[PDB]
Design a protein around this ligand. Sequence first.
Ligand SMILES: N[C@H]1CCCN(c2cncc(-c3[nH]nc4ccc(-c5c(F)cccc5F)cc34)n2)C1
Length: 273
Amino acid sequence: PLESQYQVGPLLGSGGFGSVYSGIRVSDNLPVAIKHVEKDRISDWGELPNGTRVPMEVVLLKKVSSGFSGVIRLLDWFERPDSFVLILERPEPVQDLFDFITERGALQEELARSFFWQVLEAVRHCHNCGVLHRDIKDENILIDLNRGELKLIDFGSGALLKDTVYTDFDGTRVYSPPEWIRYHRYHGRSAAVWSLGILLYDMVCGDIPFEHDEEIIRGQVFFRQRVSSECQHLIRWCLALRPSDRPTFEEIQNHPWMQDVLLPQETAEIHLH
Ligand SMILES: N[C@H]1CCCN(c2cncc(-c3[nH]nc4ccc(-c5c(F)cccc5F)cc34)n2)C1
């Protein structure tokens, strides 16, 4: 059962994603997150190998939860009469990248370089497992403050990775590529790289670059903060209006601005602790 397995604490959040409660596995005080969601509010269904009709979020999660990674992992789940309850990891102390930036203002480039890299590595992981997150942002990235490690969260907008076109999008708008805005059509990888450019700008500037459809499609990036020239270049390269002019993951990771990254543990010693 559940309540017998987990001792539910206070509500951590609630929204489209449902309601998230702080919790702890009784077996070993492991800190966990307990996410509840009503079936009636589930749009994207799918099924496990054994063919169980579960939320696509569960399918994906299970696919990226094997072994170590920068993705909060799904420990266990439960089906209820009118809802699904997922048991997910819970760093402690932890803080999402949104509040972190909101608190600290634009980040130092060395810190951003560390964070972004970890992000990239986690997205390459997801794609290896054939999963497309579809909603990468500072709100869906948690920071394990004592480790300096970032974890991806919220796969309820995700999709199985595919080489053909996507015509559905239910992720964050201002983070949506121009090709979706204009044509309602996009491809996995390249649309991902567009959101990774929004994120990078977001870190180094403290706020996303575009706000209106007009801005997203014009593709003009103005820097509100003092950013290195190498960094503005990588950012403008990810925000290339034409999907095929955007860099590949390997290209992003091989960008000058991305050399000499600090490992997590030092990132924490230097910028968090
Ligand atoms: N739109 C996003 C924004 C954040 C909440 N959302 C989701 C969606 N799917 C999984 C998890 C989630 N899985 N494990 C967790 C441990 C802590 C906290 C956590 C936290 F550290 C700080 C504030 C709020 C929190 F919810 C969340 C966790 N969270 C929706």
